Structure formats: C-alpha cells, structure tokens
Design a protein around this ligand. Sequence first.
Ligand code: FES
Ligand code: FES
Ligand code: FES
Ligand code: FES
Ligand code: FES
Ligand SMILES: [Fe+2]
Ligand SMILES: [Fe+2]
Ligand SMILES: [Fe+2]
Ligand SMILES: [Fe+2]
Ligand SMILES: [Fe+2]
Lengths: 395, 405, 407, 409, 407
Amino acid sequence: MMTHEENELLCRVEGDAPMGRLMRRHWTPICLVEEVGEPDGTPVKARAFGEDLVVFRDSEGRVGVMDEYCPHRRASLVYGRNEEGGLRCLYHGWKMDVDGNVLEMASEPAASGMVDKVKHTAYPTQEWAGMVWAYMGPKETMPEFLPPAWAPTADTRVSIAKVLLPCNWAQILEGAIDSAHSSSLHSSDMPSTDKAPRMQVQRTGYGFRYAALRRPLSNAAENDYVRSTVFVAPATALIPPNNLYNVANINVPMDDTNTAFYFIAWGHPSQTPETETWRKFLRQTVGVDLDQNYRPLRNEANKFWQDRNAMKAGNFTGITGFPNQDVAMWLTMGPIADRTHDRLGASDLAIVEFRKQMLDAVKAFEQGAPAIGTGVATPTVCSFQAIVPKTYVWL
Amino acid sequence: MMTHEENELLCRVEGDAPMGRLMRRHWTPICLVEEVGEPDGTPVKARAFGEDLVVFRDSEGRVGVMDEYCPHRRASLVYGRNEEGGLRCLYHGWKMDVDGNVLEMASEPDKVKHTAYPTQEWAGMVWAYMGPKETMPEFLPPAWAPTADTRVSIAKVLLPCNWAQILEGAIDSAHSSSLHSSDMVPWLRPSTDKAPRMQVQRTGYGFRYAALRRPLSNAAENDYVRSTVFVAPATALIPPNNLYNVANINVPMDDTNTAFYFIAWGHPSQTPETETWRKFLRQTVGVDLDQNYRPLRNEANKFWQDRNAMKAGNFTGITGFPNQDVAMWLTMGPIADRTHDRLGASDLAIVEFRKQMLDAVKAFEQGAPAIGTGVEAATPTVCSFQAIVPKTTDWRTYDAHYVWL
Amino acid sequence: MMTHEENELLCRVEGDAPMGRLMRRHWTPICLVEEVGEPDGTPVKARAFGEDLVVFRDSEGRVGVMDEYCPHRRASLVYGRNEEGGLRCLYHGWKMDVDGNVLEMASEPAAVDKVKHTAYPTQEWAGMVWAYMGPKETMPEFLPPAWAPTADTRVSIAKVLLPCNWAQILEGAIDSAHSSSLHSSDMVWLRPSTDKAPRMQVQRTGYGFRYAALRRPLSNAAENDYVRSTVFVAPATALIPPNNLYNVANINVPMDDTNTAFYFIAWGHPSQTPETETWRKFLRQTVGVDLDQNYRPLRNEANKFWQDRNAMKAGNFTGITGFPNQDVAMWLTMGPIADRTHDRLGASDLAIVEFRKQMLDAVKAFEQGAPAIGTGVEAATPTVCSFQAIVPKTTDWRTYDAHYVWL
Amino acid sequence: MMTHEENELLCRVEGDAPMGRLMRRHWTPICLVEEVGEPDGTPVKARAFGEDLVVFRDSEGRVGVMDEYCPHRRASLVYGRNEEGGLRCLYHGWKMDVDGNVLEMASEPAASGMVDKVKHTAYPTQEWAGMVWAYMGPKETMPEFLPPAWAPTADTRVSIAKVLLPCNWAQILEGAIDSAHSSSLHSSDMVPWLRPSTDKAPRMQVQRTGYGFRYAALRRPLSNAAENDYVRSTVFVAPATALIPPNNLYNVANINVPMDDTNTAFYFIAWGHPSQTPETETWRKFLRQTVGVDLDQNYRPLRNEANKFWQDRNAMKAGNFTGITGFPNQDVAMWLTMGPIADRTHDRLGASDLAIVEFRKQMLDAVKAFEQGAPAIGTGVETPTVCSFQAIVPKTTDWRTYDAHYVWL
Amino acid sequence: MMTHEENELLCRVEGDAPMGRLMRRHWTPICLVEEVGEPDGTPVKARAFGEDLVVFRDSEGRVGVMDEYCPHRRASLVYGRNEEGGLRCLYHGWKMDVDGNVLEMASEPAAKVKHTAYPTQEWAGMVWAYMGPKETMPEFLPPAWAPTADTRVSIAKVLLPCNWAQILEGAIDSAHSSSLHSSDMVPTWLRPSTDKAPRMQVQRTGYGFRYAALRRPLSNAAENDYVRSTVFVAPATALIPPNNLYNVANINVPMDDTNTAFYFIAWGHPSQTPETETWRKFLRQTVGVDLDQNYRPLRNEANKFWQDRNAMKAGNFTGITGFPNQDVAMWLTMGPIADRTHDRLGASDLAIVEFRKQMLDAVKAFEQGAPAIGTGVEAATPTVCSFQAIVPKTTDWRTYDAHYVWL
Ligand code: FES
Ligand code: FES
Ligand code: FES
Ligand code: FES
Ligand code: FES
Ligand SMILES: [Fe+2]
Ligand SMILES: [Fe+2]
Ligand SMILES: [Fe+2]
Ligand SMILES: [Fe+2]
Ligand SMILES: [Fe+2]
C-alpha cells in the first residue's frame, strides 16, 4: 500500500520534482538519429522532463540539443534556418551554434557586447546506437559517456521503435518488468504454457534483476523455466531475449503525463531485424500505426482498434502488435495511474521491488546521496532465459 | 433568485455531492438493453454520477454493471473478454462475474470483491442501484411502463450539459409555443395561445402542474388543459397525444453530462417503433448521433440551423424538436447560471422544481429519507393528460389514466 | 526585466482586470460590416474583453451589439430570429431591439417594460462595427480614427482571430527590426535600404508615441538616413509606415485573456488602395482558403504553419506564405500569454520597451483614477500619421512634416 | 442453354429493346411516395427504361412524372421551381403542369400561340402502396390500375426498402426466385428469422400461369420426414416481381424496375396487417438499408466492390457465413460481382435452378411472342388472391391445390 | 520506324492477342506470398493476361490459383469461405479445391465437374502459375535472379495503370539513370562515373539479350572503361547492374492491355541484402504510406506524383521521392499504351530498339509455330547475371567472367 504523497514523489518529473532531478543525472535519449537527417537538416521538436527542446544537425554534422525558445523573445527556434554552422531564429535573425553561443544578431549593432555575453540554455550531446543522447542535469555532474547495457560497441545492429505515449513513465516501465502479463495479454502472440509464475528478486546497484519460474510441458519435477528481466534504473528494462537477438525498452519522461517509449531489438546484423522489419512486426510504423510524430493512431476513442470478431474467433485481445496491447492497458489506467488503489499479489513482486527501490533512491538522492546507477548495467550483465535445474545472444 | 451556492447544491452529482447521494437512492437507467446485445456480447462503456462503468450480458444472459476499472491494476474492463459466466481483464486475466465475484485469477493460486451494483432490465433499459446496498428497494414499475405488454420506444442522446436544465425544459409548457412552434402546429394542437396560465400541486413524489390555454373555440366556459408530472429526482411525464404517451428521464453522467432518454409508450398497435421514433425526433444513430449516441449537431456547426429555412418561415430552422431543445440547453452553458435568470409567469413549474428539489436535498442532507422513496413513490395511476375541460371543473380533480384504447 | 505581476497587469482584460476597464474607455471594433450583411440578416457571434456578443442588423438597418445570452433564461440569441425591428430568442420568444429594450414576450401577459437587456451604443465606420463597452456616461462622441479620416477613403481589412493575447500582437507591429529578418523574403515591397540594425528613437505623446527606425540608405549613407516612422496609438493601434501608394494600420481587439481579433488595414485613395479581396489574397488571409468561415487561421502549430522546408533551402527565408502568417507563427509559439519575464532585449526593442513602460504607466495611473490614455483632447486624429522617407541626418525626424499618403 | 442474342433479348430494356416495350405494357413503380414530399415539394430525379424523369407533387397534391429535360432547350427540370400548380424551368421560365401542358412561357409574348400548342412528355401516374406509378406504354394500351398482388387494400401496411443497384434487372429477379440460395448465403441469417428445416437441397416443382408461374420447394422437415413435405411457394409475377414465402406475421414482395440496361431500382417490401407488419425504418434497419447509414441520399449503397461490401473476415472466422450484414446486402455482393449484365452463356445450372430456368424460358418466349404482336405476358385479363405461402403439407395433397391466403391475422 | 499494327502486336495480351499466347508459355508471377499468408487465409484477387483470378492457401498449405468467377452462376469466389481443404462460393455452397475440383454442391443431392485452375509454384517470395496449354508446361526451374532457397529476395510490388512494354523499356534504358535518377544515384546509391551519354553494345541470345553501357571512368579513361551490363530475359524480365552489396531484378506481368503488376527486386546474400520493408522504404513503395492495400500507388497524374517544385529549385532533379516513383511518372504520362509510332530514337536507345526488334520477331515466328523465345534448351539460367566493373579497354565484356554479387 502506497500513499498519494508517495505516488507524486515517484512519478512527477517536471521542474523541481525530485525524481526529475535524479533522472537528469543519467545521460538521456532525446530523439532518434533518423529525425535530424543530414547536416543543415530540418530542426526537430523533442520534449524531456517538461522542457521543450530543439534538436538539429549543423553544417559540420554536430548535433545540438537546446531550449526550443529563442533567448531573444521566446519564439520557437524549430522554425529556424539551420545553415552555416548555426540555427537562426526567423524573428530577428539571432543565430545559435550547437553549444548555444549567439554567433550573431542580424538586428543588433554587433559592434557591442551582447553577442559575446549571451549564452542559450544548451546541453551536451552524444550520438550512440540510433539515438541522440543529452545530459540535462547540472554541468559538472556530467559523467563520461559509457556505452550502456544493450550496445557493447557499434558492430551491433540496433533497431528502434519509438512511440510517444500520453501517460506517465512509471506505469510504462512497470509493464516491461511484469512477468505475468505475457501469459494473458500477449497470449495469442508470445517452452511453457504456464500462466502463473513464482517471483523472486535480487537487488543490485544499477537496479535489480528478477527470475520468473514456470513449469515446462512436463519435467517440472527437475525443471524450472526461468525468464530473467533486469531493471536498469531509473527507466530501462532488459527484456528476456529470444533465440536470435536481444530486446530492451527504455522510457524517457517528456513530462508528468507523457513518455517517449523506445523499444529496441539488438544483436548480430545477421540475426537482428532492420528498423522497418521491427516496426512492422510491432505495428509501430510511421505512416501506418503512428503519425509523423510517432504518436499512436490507436487511441481511447477507437478502442485501440480492438476487433471483437477476432476476439470471438480465438484471438485474445483483438489488438494487433503486442506493444499496442500494452498501450491499451497502460493508457486506461489513466494519465498517472492511481497506485493507491492497486491490489497486488504473488505475481507482482517485481513491480513492488521497483516501487521500493525508486522511492528509496529518490529519498536518498534528495538527501544528497549519489543518484541510483551513477556508481563506480554493462554490456555483459544483461537478461537471460533457460530451462535451469531445480535448486547475451549473438552468433 | 438563487445563490451561486444553492445552484452548486441543486446541480452537482459527483463524489459526495448531496444531490449525488440523494439520486443514488432510486433505480437509475445506465444504458439501453439494445446496447448490451446477445449473451456474451461486447462489453459497453457507461457513466453515472461521475462513475465509470462496464455493462455486459454474460453467458447465462445475466447483466452486470460494475466499476469500469479492474480491481487488480485498474485497466479498463471494457476491453475484457465476455464469455463463460464472466468478464476477463486482458492484462493478467482476472475474471469477474456480474456480481463482482473474482471467479478466477490467471496468474495466482470470496477472496476479493469488485464494486458491482444490482441490476434490472425493464422497458428497454438496464437499471442499476448505486445507493448503499442495504437501502435498495424492490423494483416497482415506473409510471410509464405499466407492464410487459407495453411498447416502449426510446431515443437516447448523451448531452454535454448538467441535468437540471434539461429537466427544467421538460417542465416548461410555454416553450412549445415558441421553440416548437413549427413542429407542434395549431403534431397538432387545439389552441393558438402561446401564454398558458400555470397552476401547481405539490406531491409526495414530486408535483403536477397544469397549462391552461384558450382553445380554438368555447373559451367562454372552457380551458384547454395540459398537465405534466414531475417525478423527482429527474423524470417528467409529458402530456400525451391521443395515440401514445411521452416520458423523459435524465440520468446525470457527471456534473456536466447527462444521458437523456426520450420515451414513446403505450399500446403496440398505436405506439411507434424505436427507429420510427428516432427518425421523427431526428435521433437516429449513424445519422444524427455517433455510435455512442452523442449528437453530431453542436455549437461549432450551429446545430445545423438553416438560415434560409427560417426566412422561409420555419421557426428555429433546426430539424427535430429535441435538437431544437438541445440548442437552448447547451448554449446556457455546461451548468446554467440560475443566479442570473429573469423568471416570469410561464416559469412557475420550473420555480416549483427549483424549490422542491432544494428542500429535498437540504432535507435529505439533514438525514431525511430521499424524496419519492418509500410509501411515497408514484406508479402507473399518476400521469399526465390533455383535454378540453370546463372552467367549473378543477383540473387537480380530473380523473385521467394513460391513453391506450 | 519585468515582474510576473506587471505582465499580468499589462495583459489580462477579462472581467475586472484594470487593462480591461481602461481599454473599454475607447470605442472598440466588434466585427466587420460585411459579417452582419443586409437588414434582417443572420445574427453574428463576437467576443470582446471576455463578453460574448450578438451583432445583428434590424429591418431599419440599425446595427446592434448586445450580450449573447438571453436576458430571460440565457440561451444564445445567435440562434434568434432577426426580423420586425428586433432579435427574438427561440426559446420563449423574447424579442429585443438593438437598444436592448424587450419589445415583447410571447409567453407573458404584459402585467415587458420592466426588462432591459445589456446592450451597447454602436457605430459603423471604415467597414467595421464599433461599440462603446465602458460606463455609458463616459462614452465620447465618435471621432474618425487616424487611419480612416472621412468617408471617401478606401479601407480594406483582413480580420484574423488569433489564439493568443493582444500585447504580443501589437508588440509585433511596433518592431522595425523584424522586417529586415522575418520579412526579408517579402519586404525585400519597396525598401531603399538593406540595413538590418536600424537605430531607434522615441517621442512620447499624449496618445501613445511616435518611433522612428533610421537605417543607412542605399545611396549617400554619408549624410542621409532612411527613416521609417510608426505611431503607437494607445491602447492597441499601430500606424505602420506606408508604401508610396497607400497607408497601412493594425488595430487589435482582445476577445479575452488569450485571444485577439486582429485587423490589418490598407487605406488610402480609392484608385491607389487595393480592394478587400486583393488585400486578403496578398496577405494570405482569404476566407475559405487560409481562414475558416469565422476568420480563424487554418494554419496552426500542428501543421507548422505550412512552413515549407524545400522552399527554405531554396532561398525563401521563412518558408511561410503571407507576410502576417509569418508574424503569426512567431507570436503563437511564444505562448498564449508571452512571458516578458524571460525576454532579453536590446537596442532594437526600444519601441517595445516604450510600450511596456507607457502602458504599465497608464493602467497604474488609471486604477488611481487618472483619465485613461488617449481619451479626451489628447486623442490622435488624421493629422498624426506614419511615414517613410530619406531624410538629412541634419533634420530632426520629429520635425519632418508628413501627411498620410493619398496623391 | 442460352446464347448471346437470347441474353440481349432477355436483358436490354433501353428505348429500342423488345423487353422494354413488353415491360412498358404494365404500370411501373418510379419512386417512393416519401421522396416526392409535400405539395410544392422538392422535385426528384428518377430514371426508368433509359428515360430520365422528373417527379414533383403540384400545389393540389397531384403527382406528375415527366421527362427530365425542359421541352424548350433541354435544361434539367429537376432544378426547376415547384409552385403554383406547375414546374418552372429556371432557364427561360417555361412552366409545365403534371400533364406536360406548358402553362406559361415567361419570355415569350402570349401573343404567340406557342403557349397553347407545345406539349411535354408526361405519363399517367398513380399513388399506391407507398409508391408512385407511371404507365409508359402507348396511351391507348393503358389499362385500369387494378390493385396489385401484394397491397390488397388501403388498410394494409406496406413498408418499402428502396435500393438503386448498378446491374441489369434479370439477374436480380433470378435472385428472388431461387429458394436454394438461402441455405448457403442467408445461412447465418435464417438460423433453422426462423425456418423449420436444416435442408439445403430442395426438390423443385413449377406450374405455368397466365401472369407468370407459381413454383414450390419441397424440403425435409426436422419433423415427420416420413410422410410430410415442407412447401415454400414463390410466385413470379411477370415481368419483374416476386412474391417471396411470407413468414408467420407478414408477407414479403420484391419488384424490380430496370433503370436501364445496367442499373435497377430494387423494391423489397414487407406488407400485411398494420399490427403485424414492421414500419419502414424498422424494416430498413433489419435489412440494413437505412438512408444515411447503409445508403446515400439517392438510395445508392455504400457497400461496394471497392470495399468488399464491408465483408468482415474475422466475423466469418467466427462462424458467420457471409461476413456481410443484412440479407439483401449478401444478395447484392453476389449479384454485382456477376458483372453489369450476367453472362448466362457460361452458367452451369442444376436441378435446384429449375425456377431460374423456367423464368428464362418464359420471358424469352413471351418477349418473342410480343416482338410478334401478341398481347404482352401478364396483360389481357390476367391480384391479392394468388400469393406465396408456407406450411407443413401432407404428402398426398398436391401443393398446387393448397388453400393458403396472404398472412393477415 | 514502327507501325500502329506492330505496336498492337508488341503490346496486347488479352484473349486472342499473340503476345498473350507467347507469354503464357512462361511461368508467371501471380502475386506475392505475403498476400496469402496463413492456411485458410483471406482469398486474394489477382489479374494476369486479362483474366481475374482467385488465389488462396488451403487447410494443408497448398496454394491454388483459379478463375475468379464461380463455375455455377459466375459470382466472385474472392468472397468465399476458405476452409477445410477448399474455397466455397457463398451463393450456393459449391466448394472447389486448389486444382479446380468441385468437391461438393450444398444445394444438390449426393446419391466430374471442373473449374479453370492452373498449376502453381511458390518461389522467391512469389506465387507463380502456368497459364498456358497444360501439356506445354515445363518443369519449374530457378529464375536468374533467385538461384536457390538461401537467397534473400526482397520484393516491391506496384500495380501500375499502363501497358507492360513501356515499363520494361524503362528497365533496359541505361541513359535514363543519369537524367531522371541523377539526384538519387549520385557520382542513396553511388556510381563510379559522371558520364551521362554512354557508348552502347548489344549481344543477342536465345533467351533475350545482354547489353553493355560503357561510361568513361572518373579516372584512367584511356586504357580502362566502366562497363555496366544489363540483361533482358524475355518476355518481360530485366537484370539490372548490381551495386557492390546486392543484385537488382525487375519482372513485369501484364494484368491486361493497360495495366501491369511491376515487381522490383533486391537479391543476394542475407547478410548484405535489405529486408522487404527496408527495400520498400528506400524505394518509397510501402503499403499504407505510398500504396493502398492493393499495392496501387497513391501518387498519380492528379497529384503530379507529389512533385515538389520547391525541392526542384533546391536542386533535386525530379522533386519526386523514391527512384521508381520518378520512373512511374514518366511511364504513366506516356499514356496507357505508349504510341511508339511517334518516337524519335537515338544512340542512347539502342537496347530499347533491340527489344522492339527481338520481341516483334519472336512473336511473328511464334505465330507460325516457332518455339516461344527462351523456352526449352534456350532458357536463361542463374549462370546469367548483370554486372558493373572497371574492365581493361581491350577485354571483350561479352567474355568477362562475372558472377552475381554475394561476397
Ligand atoms: S525572438 Fe528569436 S530572434 Fe528575436
Ligand atoms: S489489471 Fe486487470 S488483471 Fe491486472
Ligand atoms: S431564454 Fe430566451 S426567451 Fe427564454
Ligand atoms: S430551357 Fe427550359 S425554359 Fe428555356
Ligand atoms: S454462384 Fe457460386 S455457388 Fe451458385
Ligand atoms: Fe507487454
Ligand atoms: Fe422542448
Ligand atoms: Fe511583421
Ligand atoms: Fe437472397
Ligand atoms: Fe529508372
């Protein structure tokens, strides 16, 4: 049992919200690399922790991430001209480089100190693994960019599906680390037809790991069928792989009630599907399942496209593409799920571990501890699944 | 003159709102029987007094009405599977029967209950009881469904405003002489009198009024008397015509939304069928309303008001008499500000409603039994009427039953 | 900086807000003459300072601006029947003359005279319907504004209903620097200078202020200035530098705290000044093309104002068509009410700072009981005007003797 | 077995064609009474036998059917003004009354006797059983309007679903005399609406008459297969009418007016006792032919080839036979895919298609007979007494003997 | 120069038409495997040589291809139920098998009937059928662009509303790449040359012809040339020059006289060849974005194939996105059947000329009992491939030992 006050602490991320300041101590994904295109390419709107951002690739191929609004009079730089090593606002011709210096002011006698003085709120950025990463916490707190759990280096294929979801981050993550749901919700899609697991969790410093224990066809005398989802705090999940490639979900709070859900497949080129394969398989294709902004066309008004006939004709949910089955469940709990009223049981140990871990971490960090996960996962402490006796993937 | 405070009191239904608790002391329509369909059918979304509900018919053909959200993690049950005695949440495969019993849990070894209300099918509607369980009366018949051999045709519309203004419009004999002047024509009336003399008689369940107009002849010793019955909290028995009867009941969905049910009832040989009614009122689903019964007419489209029709001599230039009503209800805004109303002679019925329902909710707040419950409710023999009546006779005294044969 | 409270004070108009009361000390455009049409024509919804209004023209041809909501029980009179010298509500058939007298109630014995509906004195000038929306005993006689001297003038209006607060809109009209930047693909129109950083000079007046924007001209920048001069007329009019054929004015009426009716006027001699539809084509404010039937822009944040990226890499500055749509993309993205708290201004925003200083002054003064800015003997007239000329560096531009362009 | 020239004889109706003038020997439905509205009401467009017609109700309530094109310079009279006992073309203000008399020529001096001496094509008309009818034959062949087969008297409720279909009429009528199809196509819809038989293969039996033929379909009952027949009797009333087997409460009729060679007005009618017969909208709902939901304002269907008639594949995997909603819509899916004019030249017909074969024989025979100058089939001295029926009937009483009347009370 | 009649002979495929009979001597793609999917899947409508077809995979997984119209009264089998070993017509419940056999006729007693259906084969992502005389059906051999089952073959399908021949002409026309696709396959694809006007040579074979486009290489143009070799495999298949990672083929199938199914293929080693959706995305031929559910393009003459005039000013050649889409606009605007009568050809069109000659000759011969081009021991096999390579100025390209790309 949690309280309204506890729920706000965990979930809110905008402005001063403790969880926000915590999360900004980690390098965060801002948008997809496919969004910023070639040098001088079209500016792009993104949103993180309640802050509206421009992103764009300059003449030299450097990618900046900056406050969306012009330091002059707050017009949106997303309309700006991205040329000649800059991004120039349309209103008065102020030009910012990717580091947020004002290179020029078309309209102000630049033979005067306003050009040199004025810096524009801008952020360090890194391109890794198909995403633009930014560091949006305090300047000096900025760690070296250490390649994450799900991309050793870059001889790996990474295939991303992005979705902008209109609900809070914490419910979306919970759903990643929820072993039981796969046996009901995903049961027309997903070596065990076992609907009920026994849950066991072992906490670490990056987050936690948990194994879910199911009975295979028979041989459950000697056998446990184990599915180990790792939680990498604050917002990543390493989904138990398949025979071919690895699967991770990382969520980024755009604000209190919206989230950038990245669902990744990754591994050996020979074995990991290309972006458009992945997306079609997940039913998350721009132009078909998503609008040009990676928001979903499935929605509450059309009931996530549910087909009652497919349901009567055997299909469990009548919803195409497994994440969209998650999305229907997630969005219906509401913009921020009211955890106060939850009725949890043996199958939800994982969600409870996450609740505990994060509330502690934010409390800790808010009392001045180092932020959870910024300690002294990694590319070979990831997820697993095997029929392991009683008591990553590549080529 | 009302206060901003009394108007909150009269109007608000959500949460603890007094008028809320009061209303949940009657049986209430949740949705139509047509919506629920065959046993094992598609679950249905509904809303009442600011609660979200699933309605579904199970394999036995029993209808459940329950909180919309799963007792587990609050996922919408409206997506669940309705089959094999129960409704199953998609997420973790919890399954409820209609009574709220968590029959089975897919991922786990009278354990846990889910909020679920008693239900009752009657005259084309699924009723439920949302008051404290121990208060539930036995389902008497409403005053507009004698028995099962009565044809009951229902127009449902979901209107985006507060309930009270919608009812007030049912108990407002004057309006039909202006607003519906092109649709209820000297439908046909034996009077050109637009200004009816109003008279009221308070009762145990609400009240009756009369609207005494000058008939097309004999007005020396003759009134044309129209009588309407208000059945608290939110029901009006409209004067019939001489083939069938008319009734309106309004369920508040929340503080600014109402399920408006407009019924035609009587003897099947003489009462129009559902779709016929709908076409007449222009409330046909897929023509006038979307698949959830919300109008396609709205402020942006000006309820399709035809400015030429109006220069041609149609009065409102909006097709379908209730839509003409809707135009007026919705413009007063999502809760009418009765603080700023300048009422007159024709508003006597509305005034009695204003007073009675305030007394009732005040009374009820101080621990009185809710208006119209108990020994007090109306039934078949209380009714509306219309007839040419001699001025020597009191209308209070007129012995009218519902038109039939 | 400015403080949060100052911004609130300067911007909000709804209900009791001082700026609201102040602005209602001036006759206000409510809507266009062409909206109200013929005697006994369709009634028309309008909005000013957060009140909903009906405009209609009775059988006699008098135009009325009253409260939208029926005095009886509050239905909208916009649905009413406009005939026989009044507007009849559809609900119970109360009928109101333009003056707000209730002529008749179909539902009542006259045992009618009692009730008066909120109604405002009206005036028809320069293709607009005007109303005096403040305390009646303080209504001035209607004099001709600076941009419509008398009746032989052509006045061509683009009306646009912008979903943002009025002050950022006017700010955009008293800003000469932006024409070099935003409008560089458009006002590249007649301009005898390619200066981007004009020097700004102000002259406070009793009705507002004249500013001037001095650029180096194309020839003889040695001893000559290109002078463009704009007049701010409180509370929300701008007189824009004319071209050599007609004049150009902006008047903004706030419909509420976050919406403004925006009027962009071409005016001058009938045979030099474009007609209404030419003006809307040029500005891309054509109803049915660029605007819906209520004058709201079909361009919006979601469509990115139809900004065209290929057109931009092709040499077009903004990629947005219609010079004002270009303003519009800037204004609406600053937010419903612009946060001046966060501005970082330079020498170019001098006029803008004058505006904020003058108008904060005038509202503070007004809430003390000073006469409201630009009322009475102080009001600008025909003889105040904007202008563009090449002027000697040795002549004060304030002294330069300009008249509005005609012939 | 049939050839191309037989098919054109049977099917084509436009101006030239024999089948056309054979059909113009009967009164024909032109449009619903509902369409024509009030006196002075909006004019309506209709089309029969390749002729464009205006339909309007004049100031007196008299209903005219005329040619669509103004007799002046050929503008469409559908756009005209319907007032003051006439219909005035917008172009030059010529005004016609319901009998094609030119009342006025607003732009011609009445000093010119053109006014008195121009006549516009117009047909005799009749309002009956919810429909406007016109006689389109030569004037002097016009019969009296005898009350027809499926609207006995005036106190009968007649509930009409109209549907304009873009194919030739014959293949549609064929659809209505084909008792076999319902056990496949309407198999999820007439779940054994009720039928007392699980029997698909019905032994057919014909019997010529003077107006058409009565046929029956003998089916094994779920009860007393030993010595009991379940008769399902259709009547074909030439040219293009079918009295379908009425269910327990009301009678069902179909009548098809060819709009031209490749389009057909299809009227599907429920008729009987006011208390027993459903109303227009309830019927249209049932049938899924509601204007504004399943059809546009011209009674044209929204279901079409392009959208696969809203066939729902998931519904069909759920055990729904056709995956199409509304039984006529299932017929339509089939009738239209056969193409604008079905090529009977490739038909591989069988014992269950006897009905259709007899239909072909008759109309091919009666059209050549008429093409020769004999009275057209159905005309001469050849109403509601002969009807469809259905019963469990003993095995030694011939069904051509059965005394069954139209379903009333 | 060609005559109206020859053009008729070359292009028509429906019914009588000889070029119809000739083509129906080859195995023909009918539709994609993806379309029929699961056993008991949704029946698919197709169209070859002027006949409508039903395709469907049955309970066991066999794929039948048949005449669309039911043998009984000619309704569409496309609307039928595909279960339990058959496709059953909805009308009267006749049920066919993949082979044409009527297993059952619901409304007909129980106490030989056969429907037009063709031999089928699944390969390389396609359902093929043999739609010519049964006893002239050859064993199905691997086509030159999909050798074995360990190839990755990724197909884009687009139903195109013009005649097949102008579409194949477009595949064998090398000089077009340096004009139409100049913004797409630049000095994103890269070619080792800037030369637009190449010296061409043609070698006629039994199965069609090979030809070579000799561009001068960016460097060493004196003693080495850049050879790009296309292969025409009759009747309507082209093997396009590979890139360095994968091969590219185009097969066309006449749906009728004025509509072709166009299949544009990427093939090679799994580790080097794109998957379907990557292919489609790159060519902008994605179902739901560029094409409707039937693979018909959303680009068309009405919308000018989405020609972006601003991008053309920016320096994009065609302003049409997706290199095949640039092709489509040229092909379609030529008209449903291109009138070669009005063609004025030149050097660059040598291969096209060669096609017109070969195929006119092949069809004339065929009519008088010659064997159909590229059947029997004459057939192209996988040993045939297109290549690009920098080759010594005095090596005969005809003899170069080139194998299709793989590693
Ligand atoms: S607001 Fe961006 S340059 Fe002025
Ligand atoms: S929320 Fe319904 S079972 Fe989990
Ligand atoms: S509200 Fe207008 S007359 Fe009653
Ligand atoms: S064409 Fe009809 S009046 Fe002249
Ligand atoms: S038409 Fe195919 S079964 Fe009768
Ligand atoms: Fe999931
Ligand atoms: Fe009403
Ligand atoms: Fe501007
Ligand atoms: Fe049928
Ligand atoms: Fe090409």
